[PDB]
Design a protein around this ligand. Structure first.
Ligand code: NA
Ligand code: NA
Length: 193
């Protein structure tokens, strides 16, 4: 029922990380920001890059922590405390190992699912924020997980992921308008065209 007023993209800073699957949440938020002409500027007070503007009739903040993934909470937590944004108004976009490329899900609540960014966030604001789980695949062995999240995907997997992200961006109107059950049905029904 509450409007989404803060959208957070999780990822690592620097050009060596920018195309890595771990930066799926940066992809989503950076595309969104540019779709609506919202400028992401350096915001060192909150250890991130941040912005604010109109999306489909609503005042929305955007945040990319520049803390490195595992310390994402050092940006998100004080940012959302300072602007007094309840967790229920936060959507956090992140890579999801447990879903394949081309799969994308909106989830409300729950835990971190082993994701090391969310792991740094859930303890401080609690679990009740919305999550855009952008599927990146699982390599297979738990050995190869680090090299997979920190690697660039091949073009085919990338096109599926980018398709998923395009679809979720088309649904942000619902989310910022408070229409979370509808956004969720519609996001979660996505399948590659
Ligand atoms: Na822009
Ligand atoms: Na920008």
């Amino acid at each position: 029922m509450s409007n989404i007023s803060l959208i957070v993209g999780l990822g690592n800073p620097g050009s060596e990380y920018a195309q890595t699957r771990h930066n799926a949440g940066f992809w989503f938020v950076e595309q969104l920001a540019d779709k609506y002409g919202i400028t992401l500027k350096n915001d060192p007070k909150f250890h991130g890059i941040s912005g604010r503007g109109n999306i489909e009739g609503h005042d929305v903040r955007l945040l990319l922590p520049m803390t490195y993934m595992n310390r994402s909470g050092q940006s998100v937590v004080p940012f959302s405390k300072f602007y007094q944004i309840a967790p229920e108004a936060i959507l956090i976009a992140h890579d999801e190992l447990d879903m394949n490329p081309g799969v994308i899900r909106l989830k409300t609540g729950g835990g971190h699912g082993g994701h090391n960014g969310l792991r740094d966030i859930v303890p401080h604001i609690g679990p009740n924020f919305h999550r855009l789980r952008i599927g990146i695949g699982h390599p297979g062995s738990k050995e190869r997980v680090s090299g997979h999240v920190l690697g660039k995907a091949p073009s085919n997997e990338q096109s599926l992921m980018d398709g998923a992200i395009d679809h979720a961006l088309s649904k942000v109107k619902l989310l910022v308008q408070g229409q979370v059950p509808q956004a969720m049905n519609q996001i979660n029904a996505y399948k590659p065209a």
